[PDB]
């Protein structure tokens, strides 16, 4: 993947957004923006240029799964990589993420190494 790939980090908890952003920076990905929920995220996505989405599962107004579906059903954004982040891995949620088209699924908190590992699995799958 290109070091300048533009990421959108979505979470209603500001501290977690900062942490994910810092983890991305640690891996050399500096082009990162933030959104506080699914609605805010879609609003900023309408601006264009985004190449990767990392979204939390539980957020008000529009949660992670709802954001993911919206992206996948949109003609311009349908192929965007989306890594889902959750507080707890659950069978039902995992199957739901698969059905909706999640590129990845990871439990927080996670280290830089783990993030790197999840991103690389997605890049490889997508030939990025």
């Amino acid at each position: 993947a290109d070091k300048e790939l533009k990421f959108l980090v979505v979470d209603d908890f500001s501290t977690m957004r900062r942490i994910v952003r810092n983890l991305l920076k640690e891996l050399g990905f500096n082009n990162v923006e933030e959104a506080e929920d699914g609605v805010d995220a879609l609003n900023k996505l309408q601006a264009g240029g985004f190449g990767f989405i990392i979204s939390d599962w539980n957020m008000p107004n529009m949660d992670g799964l709802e954001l993911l579906k919206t992206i996948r059903a949109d003609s311009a954004m349908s192929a965007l990589p989306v890594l889902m982040v959750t507080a707890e891995a659950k069978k039902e949620n995992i199957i739901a993420a698969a059905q909706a088209g999640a590129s990845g699924y990871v439990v927080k908190p996670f280290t830089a190494a783990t993030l790197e590992e999840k991103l690389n699995k997605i890049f490889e799958k997508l030939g990025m």
């Binding site: 891995a89 659950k90 069978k91 995992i94 199957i95 993420a97 698969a98 999640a102 990845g104 699924y105 990871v106 699995k121 799958k125």
Partner: peptide, 13 residues
């Protein structure tokens, strides 16, 4: 946990 982990592994997550 073992099962959750195997599910994730099977799905490529």
């Amino acid at each position: 946990q073992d099962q959750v982990d195997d599910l994730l592994d099977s799905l490529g997550f």
